[PDB]
């Protein structure tokens, strides 16, 4: 089952740091910040091989009973199957600030202007090893 | 709903630190380390007023489809309704090492000799504000 932190509010100004390991033959895994598995304010998918996407990040939001909004992509991909990764996220009213394993950064809009989130979870072909939310 | 960290293995040698706030009129709240809401290796209940228990800690384990084992109690109680608390837990094969808000400590046996746990959760009349598991 997915790895998740639930009902510990991730509030404006706090930092989230997750560490984990990518599966050896992973297709893709995502890190997700939102309210539920059907309501995601920041989805960041790490695609090793998914349709036409090879070694790319795909970011988006998921709206409950509505679906996926406008995707954003990054070619930054310091991720390796079988190896550890670390991701750090913080946000303000307008922007999610994401930092990747190698120090490179991606930003994604806070489309609802949310000030807090009650669910963080990893899905797909990876596992989490540690978390700091504070 | 309860506050929980699920499927991020709390392994031998790692530290868990949780911060939160006690509800103003709290009866009791617990911090729980185990596998499920019916399988708890270390339950630590903070009882402000519960039956005959006033301002006491009660620790125990809960075995799936079996029930509560032998309780252990502590009179250490540096907890106040409406106020923040912080708890730090680590364990080895035989012992859970718990440190309370004021630096006082409680120990509780690792009765199954478990080396890892997939569920941490808070229940009852409090809320969590931060977590470190690493
Ligand atoms: O937008 C994130 C979302 O993508 C879905 O896949 C998209 C894919 O990125 C797009 O190229 C194709 O046109 O449509 C697919 C279906 O919506 C993933 O399925 C989904 O899990 C999220 O990762
Ligand atoms: O053992 C922890 C467990 O206690 C239950 O309450 C006990 C109570 O401590 C004991 O004094 C009384 O003899 O039996 C009660 C019922 O088992 C709590 O109900 C339970 O939630 C845990 O906190």
């Amino acid at each position: 089952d997915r790895a998740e932190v639930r009902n510990i509010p991730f509030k404006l100004g706090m930092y989230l740091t997750v560490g984990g390991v990518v599966n050896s033959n992973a297709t893709r895994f995502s890190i997700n910040v939102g309210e539920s598995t059907d309501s995601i304010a920041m989805h960041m998918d790490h695609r090793f091989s998914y349709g036409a996407d090879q070694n790319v990040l795909v970011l988006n939001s998921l709206v409950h009973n509505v679906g996926w909004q406008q995707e954003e992509r990054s070619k930054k991909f310091p991720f390796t199957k079988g190896d550890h990764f670390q991701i750090t996220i913080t946000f303000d009213t307008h922007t999610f600030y994401i930092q990747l394993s190698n120090g490179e950064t991606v930003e994604f809009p806070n489309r609802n202007k949310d000030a807090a989130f009650n669910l963080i979870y990893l899905a797909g072909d990876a596992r989490l090893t540690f978390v700091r939310l504070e």
Side-chain angles (χ1 to χ4, degrees), chain A residues 30-89:
Chain A
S30 61
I31 181 77
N32 300 273
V33 172
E35 287 300 311
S36 71
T37 58
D38 200 45
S39 187
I40 305 173
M42 193 296 292
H43 165 80
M44 180 166 51
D45 197 21
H46 306 71
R47 297 178 178 189
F48 294 88
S49 189
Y50 180 65
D53 292 323
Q54 292 155 1
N55 304 310
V56 286
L57 295 177
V58 179
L59 296 89
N60 205 349
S61 52
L62 170 67
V63 172
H64 181 51
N65 203 211
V66 168
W68 293 102
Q69 303 305 301
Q70 168 69 63
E71 290 184 351
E72 295 195 353
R73 290 177 174 233
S74 174
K75 297 159 288 311
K76 306 169 164 68
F77 201 79
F79 301 96
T80 300
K81 292 180 288 185
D83 292 353
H84 289 251
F85 67 87
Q86 185 169 124
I87 296 158
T88 295
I89 303 165

Side-chain angles (χ1 to χ4, degrees), chain A residues 87-107:
Chain A
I87 296 158
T88 295
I89 303 165
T90 194
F91 67 90
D92 61 26
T93 61
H94 282 106
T95 304
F96 288 99
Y97 294 100
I98 298 159
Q99 192 162 222
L100 312 177
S101 308
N102 64 341
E104 285 185 307
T105 72
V106 173
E107 291 78 48

